Amino acid sequence: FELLHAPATVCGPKKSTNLVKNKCVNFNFNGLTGTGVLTESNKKFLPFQQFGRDIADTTDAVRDPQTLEILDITPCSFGGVSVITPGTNTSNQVAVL
Amino acid sequence: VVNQNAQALNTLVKQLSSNFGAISSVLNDILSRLDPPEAEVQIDRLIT
C-alpha cells in the first residue's frame, strides 16, 4: 500500500460521526489525526488538490471524504502559565497571566 | 538584525519536515502505526 499521498480508497470500518464546527475538537480524516478548529475555507482547491501542508509539514486544510466541502485545520489558543506574586512574606493572593 | 532573527526562526520551522531517519516526519501518524513496545525505537530517532 501507499501512505498519505494518494486519495484513500481502502479504509477502516468505523462509524461516520457527525462533524462539530468552529470549536477545538479532534479529527480523523483518512487516518490523519490532529487537534484544532475546523472552519469553512477560502483558497479554492483544484479538483485533485486533496491534502494540505505548510512550512512545518503540519496539516492546515482537509476535505470531507463524504461531502464535497473544503475545510481548514487551525490549532486554537494555547500558551504558557505565568504567575505574578508579591512574595510569600507579603501575602497569598497572586495574579496569573 | 531583524531579518536575521526572523531568518533563523523560519529555518527552525523547516526542520520539522525532516524525519531524521524515521518512517515519517509527523509524530501524529507514527503512534497510529507502531505499538508503544516498539514505538520507542522510531520516536527516539526523532527526539535526538
Binding site: 505548510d54 512550512i55 512545518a56 | 531583524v2 526572523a6 526562526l9 523560519n10 520551522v13
Partner: peptide
C-alpha cells in the same frame, strides 16, 4: 524631530518615517 500633537501618539516626524522603512500567514505558521 520634536513630537507633534497632530497624531494621537507622541511619535515624532522622523520616528514614523523610521518606523515605516524596516518591516518584520508567515507569522501564523510559527
Amino acid at each position: 524631530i520634536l513630537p507633534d500633537p497632530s497624531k494621537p501618539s507622541k511619535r515624532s516626524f522622523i520616528e514614523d518615517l523610521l518606523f515605516n522603512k524596516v518591516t518584520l500567514d508567515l507569522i501564523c505558521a510559527q
